[PDB]
């Protein structure tokens, strides 16, 4: 019927002025563009079919051709950036926005999907979709008393498209658009569907990946407790974006970090810092490193939750990137901590793994470790116990590593190692 | 000690095809 048509036949059917022949040719095009392997998007574009599809988007009296052309254009916009640009150049954005209010739910859902692709191309097309006025009808589609009355696929598509509207930087989405979207996004963040939750968390993570004002916009909506709850979820697709959002939030001010701590986030990190998935471990260690860069009371809350031994463990054995994040966490801890917190750090057994990591090839981690060791030595000086720390470092084999680094190619490593050896060894 | 922001994503485009 409409299966395995040639682009020639599709073009002849769409060039006929018989709306039913046009409909069947458009369905054949949709079926070609929906094939698993190498859909012929470039050939369809070269045939000049995008303007015809966009015109078909406005055939209110023929809902089937609206649906077929919307699907075809969605799949074309899912290709390269040049093909999404081809779709946009045909005028598809306002037509899809007009279709958002279609009485046919499948047509509205397809329009949502297409706008999601277009906005997902990048920040320019994201802002252009916003300028054409998509947010208001999109949100109207979600203005229901209970989200559970909506079809699951429809709701997932709406959530994904909104997340794409929140995505990308340079520039970030317009502030007014973010404020207009956020309430619905929180409501979705409280939904029970795992995919909706994952996409909502990803959107919140996008919105929190920026200056402190952007983070404040999100945290004032009260999302942090729900984010922590989702941090404790069993589904990795939910935990990953929730952890990303929590990390972004703790990159902000001390009060936003304190909001994260007050919600009970630290109690989840014993599992996260031992999670079998390496990415979770790395992101959790980065989050901990940003939390140890906070106030001394926040470092003390890290201590009270028994998380210093977990940092020692990650420093002892983990993928090298997680170990680098842990070294950063240790250096921030030692930079901002009290003498008592630093001696507690040493009592947990940090010196030996911190020294074993001086074997690495990365220069920046070496500099970070040497800075942490200098801070720990300053604490030991204030206690008059420099010789005990030096004996510890010498027994570990760390003095060998430091004296070797005296001959390192980088200037800072050279000078830091020589300072340590001149002042304490 | 300064807060260290997350590294930029290398996934610049997020688009989906309907099969």
TrEMBL record, chain B:
This is ORF4b. The chain holds residues 21 to 39 of 69 of the full protein. It comes from the Viruses. The lineage of its organism: Viruses, Riboviria, Orthornavirae, Pisuviricota, Pisoniviricetes. Residues 1-11 have a biased composition (Basic residues).
